Amino acid sequence: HFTPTPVSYTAGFYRIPVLGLTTRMSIYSDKSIHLSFLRTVPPYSHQSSV
Amino acid sequence: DYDWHVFSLVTTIFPGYRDFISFIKTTVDNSFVGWDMQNVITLDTSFEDAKTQV
């Protein structure tokens, strides 16, 4: 479920942007924790808009 | 304590501001003191002095 956390932590130590491709959990939108995470798929909390 | 019951609120888009705003609103709405909050001003980006000035 949460296998791209080590990469985001180690990279965001230096503020090197990280692009996610298939991870869709809602925790990665919290920019206080994951400082430099972008992704091309919307998370699990836009089905609310639908 | 110092009887400043009328205030405002100026917040940028720095992460973690929605929790601040929500907590302040609920705490104001659940007290007997009677806070007279006037404005909730949120800036969008680095102010151009064009729309944030108003």
**A to B CB pairs, distance under 8 Å:** 4
CB contact at 8 A, B13 and B46: no
Chain B residues with CB inside 8 Å of A32's CB? Answer: 15-16
For residues A3 and A28, give the distance between their C-alpha atoms in angstroms, rounded to a whole number: 12
**Contact status of B14 with chain A (Cβ, < 8 Å):** no
Q: Hey, what amino acid is at A4? A: P
Tokens of B41: 């001003």
Rounded to the nearest angstrom, the minimum Cα separation between B14 and chain A is 9
Resolution of the model in angstroms = 3.4
Distance, CA of B47 to CA of B54 (rounded, Å): 11
Please tell me the distance from the alpha carbon of residue B5 to that of residue B7, in angstroms, as a whole number: 6
Any chain A CB within 8 A of the CB of B34? no
Question: Chain A window 19-48: which residues touch B at a Cβ cutoff of 8 Å?
Answer: 30-32
Other C-beta atoms within 10 Å of A34: how many? 19
**CA nearest A29 in B: which residue?**
B15
C-alpha span between B54 and B43 (Å, rounded):
11
Residue B47 φ/ψ region, left for φ over 0, alpha for ψ in the -120 to 50 degree band, beta for the rest? beta
Instruction: Judge residue A20's burial from the number of C-beta atoms within 10 Å of its C-beta, 0-12 exposed, 13-18 middle, 19 or more buried.
Output: middle
